[PDB]
Amino acid sequence: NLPPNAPACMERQLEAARYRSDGALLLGASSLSGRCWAGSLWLFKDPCAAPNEGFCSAGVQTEAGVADLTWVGERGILVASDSGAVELWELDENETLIVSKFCKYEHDDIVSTVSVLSSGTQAVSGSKDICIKVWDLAQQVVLSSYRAHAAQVTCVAASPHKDSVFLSCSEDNRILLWDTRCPKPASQIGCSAPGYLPTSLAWHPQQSEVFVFGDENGTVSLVDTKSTSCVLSSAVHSQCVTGLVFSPHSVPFLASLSEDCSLAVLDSSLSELFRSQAHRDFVRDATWSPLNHSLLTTVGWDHQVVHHVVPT
Amino acid sequence: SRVSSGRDLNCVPEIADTLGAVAKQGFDFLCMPVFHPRFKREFIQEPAKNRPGPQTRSDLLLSGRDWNTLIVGKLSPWIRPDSKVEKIRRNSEAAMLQELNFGAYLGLPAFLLPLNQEDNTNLARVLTNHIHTGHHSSMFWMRVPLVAPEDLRDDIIENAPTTHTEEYSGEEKTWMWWHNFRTLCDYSKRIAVALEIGADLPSNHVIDRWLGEPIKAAILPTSIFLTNKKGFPVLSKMHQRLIFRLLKLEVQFIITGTNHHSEKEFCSYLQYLEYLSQNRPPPNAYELFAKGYEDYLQSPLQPLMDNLESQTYEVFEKDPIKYSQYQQAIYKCLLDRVPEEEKDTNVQVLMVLGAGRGPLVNASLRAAKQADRRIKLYAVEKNPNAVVTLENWQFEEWGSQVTVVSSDMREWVAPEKADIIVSELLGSFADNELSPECLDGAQHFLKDDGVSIPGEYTSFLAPISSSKLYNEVRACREKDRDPEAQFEMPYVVRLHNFHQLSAPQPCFTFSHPNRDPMIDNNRYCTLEFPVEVNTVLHGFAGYFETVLYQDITLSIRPETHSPGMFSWFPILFPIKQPITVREGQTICVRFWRCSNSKKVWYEWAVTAPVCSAIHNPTGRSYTIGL
Ligand SMILES: C[C@@]1(O)[C@@H]([C@H](O)c2ccc(Cl)c(Cl)c2)O[C@@H](n2ccc3c(N)ncnc32)[C@@H]1O
């Protein structure tokens, strides 16, 4: 047990699980119950040691919960707070401490979603306040603030290779394809008015004009921008689709999360390869090992860090 | 009283610190989640169902006192009882009951639920079921915006533009969200509005829809505040009007969102409302006293059937304008009847009919002196308790100038006929205390050329919207009578939270003396009220004007209101069922004055744009005793 100036105990509800280029594991966690409702960030250079707080590379407490986070390159961690703040933490040179560089209270409700753009100098945040904001990570400011949606913003996803493009989706049943180059930046896509609310988004890493979205009814769907309305889909989950993460593989696989507490893994026809009832509460993230493309790490609110070996 | 103000957060890491910080900023209360807003819970499907550990934080974190007074609960925003997904409806049902039940367990004084879409039918069913599970008085604040979020979204979707077409009905849609929800919940007095104000206000007609509605709270997001050059947060001229209007409805102000003015403290916003509160257009005499009686229903006085108490006389004697106008009316009448050449030889028989405790007898004397004319005065009063006051005045002061008569003016045999009869027998609907029948019975002892003061009076009606007063009336059901009787009787009420849908129009008029042979005081009157808004009709406001003499008048008709007579509140005639009225439509109402030997009463019906039942047929619910 070597807890190096970090919290003695890590909060039950794990929201975030993200592998860095080198294969070290970023964990985000919040307390959604009990006396104190706050959050913590953790680095585990030993993936298999987590979630144990003692066998820890680095860890710190945030004022409030962790709705979403992501890596800013290799040193940086961008955080969606309940406070309405987007905050940037980056590791010190030793990678033993995690220090706040900026905490900016710019959103009027919980920050629900955050994504780093292709360049890695800009990021977009989404909030329950219905706004979407584009951030200068250099100057620590909101460049642009958009009220495009009519309800809570659920998920925002930056384009792989375009610093001006990103997808958003909201409880107003809109999927907006953004492009900050157009004087009217957003564009609505998907026809059916009675189609179930969109809950998750993932850009295809190769085909930079294809993405997937999960609906609140467990359906995962494959969309081509050029194809538009023509779609392929599968009823994968019994409850909401929380998250969609593509593998680093050459012809990639799709991990799908759900509140049905299962993980799925799918090919590019959306047929079911793997399954996992491993989790006993909601599944909140999936991250593929850079080092072994067969490995897939999930975290849940059951506080399990399950390392899956995909048959591939 | 200074403005009552609360803070709205959707994030509380520690209750103790948060409440302290918020209290330190100067807020009267805190709106906060009672479960963590992101803590979605499963009630059916395993394994999520059996999630261990505490479902939220302990009640031991605050005193009962703090819970009861400082904390407004908030529904978790994932709870969507009207979702199109069955699993989400069933979970949101359980979760809403859970959170609402915890609110009750904590004894929270209020609890916030949003109306953020058109269909809240299931939300209403679950809230209604909760209201009818125990006898709690806890309030429900429906968070509903002036402008639907869809109608204030930035115009930045290239292939989905914001409609530039004016939509009169469309721009009012959020009122209909509220109307439908409170209709489904059958007008529960526990369900009120928390009206969320946006950056751009809508048209006045949209703000005018919320007139008469039970607004308990107004929510001001930080974002809508403009900045003073010095740096203080401020509000546009138009926003400052809405705030002034809302202060008159003594609503509690909630401030939501993060501090957008970084250099400034959060108490800065709060201090602006208090500043705005200090500086408001001054309230008149009948806006200052009437304070305490706002939308308070009372039985109209019947001083014929009943003997008024000493303190009732007192209240209505404290009105210098009433007496100064009566003094002036008698003054002008005496000079017209007694030429300067005859002043010392010609004594006028002035008779006060219903002389109360004397101040009108005094007024009649003050009139005769300043006119320099001689008067023989009779003070006729039926109330033997007030006759005690008169006869003590008559012996101690007035002398044999005043003959006190302890008699009904209809029964009294006069020794000599009168030149002037002076009476004070009017109510808020003029003839509702039965001045006509009273003076008619006294008419036979007025000289052929005699003057009645007052000479005429006229009643006025206007249609009103007030979901508030409708609910006040609804709440006047008594055991051992017709369960709808409360709707078939007039109330005296300082109409406060309401909307006048049309200019007052004259209803019934009476002239004195009534030389007319075969006198008939019964009346039938059709009124057509042009309405230029969408609204809901809950009843009719009654007023009156009286000509004492010539140009000397008293009025409680708002557009000609006498300066004072603040004590005289409007009459409310309710209707059993509210009637939807669309802009451009005519409200047709029909009023009857009806009678027999024993009692007078009103019947009324709306005949356009739909028909009501005739109210108070045969005076079954309400009569005025002869
Ligand atoms: C209240 C009264 O004193 C008085 C009048 O209504 C009044 C006077 C002064 C004030 Cl301040 C107020 Cl509030 C009200 O008229 C008397 N009254 C009524 C009918 C009647 C009759 N038919 N014969 C004789 N007196 C009559 C009543 O008892």
Author numbering:
A (entry chain B): 18 to 329
B (entry chain A): 12 to 637
Task: Pull text from the paper.
Protein arginine methyltransferase 5 (PRMT5) is an arginine methyltransferase which utilizes the methyl donor S-adenosylmethionine (SAM) to symmetrically methylate arginine residues on a variety of proteins. PRMT5-dependent symmetric di-methyl arginine (SDMA) mark is essential for spliceosome assembly and normal splicing. Several preclinical studies have demonstrated that PRMT5 inhibition results in synthetic lethality with splicing factor mutant leukemia cells.
Here we describe the discovery and characterization of PRT543, an oral potent, selective inhibitor of PRMT5, in preclinical studies as well as a phase I dose-escalation/expansion trial in patients with relapsed/refractory (R/R) myeloid neoplasms (NCT03886831). PRT543 is a nucleoside analog inhibitor that binds the SAM pocket of PRMT5. We solved the co-crystal structure of the PRMT5/MEP50 complex with PRT543 at resolution of 2.5 Å. The dichloride phenyl ring of PRT543 displaces F327 and forms a unique π-π interaction with Y324 in the α1 helix, which is specific for PRMT5. As a result, PRT543 is highly selective against a wide array of 37 methyltransferases. PRT543 potently reduced the methyltransferase activity of the PRMT5/MEP50 complex in vitro. PRT543 was a SAM- and MTA-competitive and substrate-uncompetitive inhibitor of PRMT5, with a slow off rate and a long residence time indicative of a slow binding inhibitor. Treatment with PRT543 showed a dose-dependent reduction of symmetrically dimethylated SmD3, a core splicing factor and PRMT5 substrate. PRT543 robustly inhibited cell proliferation in a broad panel of cancer cell lines and tumor growth in AML xenograft models. We also present the crystal structure and functional characterization of PRT543 and demonstrate that it exerts its anti-tumor effect as a SAM and MTA-competitive and substrate-uncompetitive inhibitor.
